[PDB]
């Protein structure tokens, strides 16, 4: 069974997938949490008749990203908490058959990420955004926005898109020729490396991450320090 560890904050897409020949319809999928067992349960969300119902405390940050015309029943959770922390549990029914598969997920929630990282002038740096999971490509989006206090207006500082001939577009203002993709998109990661760290780099970086039209975002304070 997976074990996902993710910082608190942080998305995590906890795969369901049952492996065919075919592609085949999903007719239903339930992902239910228990903090142990803790002789306690409950919903994350449940699917039948071609609708998903998010429930309870996962409500607003559970989606059911997986392709339900190809036998994928995935989750994403958003914004974890720690009282996340415990077992998820897919059960799976695809359409015109009569088993059921069911994969438990451990999910361990780690203190969230400081806001801040500190960087000296004319160093290089990474700035980190990746979605946890079990499953490759799923990300279809990447979008590095950058603001400085005096900003009247968030300028585009790398962009990816996967559903795209265009692909990759870097800044060609502030950031030009130094900065590109560190990470591999197709194993959801879109992390990117700052060259030569200037003060003027000073301010926040926001990293929107899709999974399709479902965007994780993503918040860093650089802080530029002499010596
Ligand atoms: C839907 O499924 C039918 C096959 O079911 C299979 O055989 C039975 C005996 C079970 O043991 C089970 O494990 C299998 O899934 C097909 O014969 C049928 O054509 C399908 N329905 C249609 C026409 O879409
Ligand atoms: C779910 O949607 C599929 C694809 O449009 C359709 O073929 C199927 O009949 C639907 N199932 C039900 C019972 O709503
Ligand atoms: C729930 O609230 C979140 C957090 O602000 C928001 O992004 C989202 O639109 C809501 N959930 C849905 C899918 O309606
Ligand atoms: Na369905």
Redesign the pocket.
Known sequence: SPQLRVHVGESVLMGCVVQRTEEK?V?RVDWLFSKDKDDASEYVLFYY??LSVPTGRFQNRSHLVGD??HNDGSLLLQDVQKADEGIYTCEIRL?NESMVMKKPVELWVLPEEPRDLRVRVGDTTQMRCSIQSTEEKRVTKVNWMFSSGSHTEEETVLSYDSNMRSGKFQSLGRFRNRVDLTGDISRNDGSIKLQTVKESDQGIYTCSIYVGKLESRKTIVLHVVQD
Do not use: A, Y
């Open positions: 319809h007719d008749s071609n339900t015309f359409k």
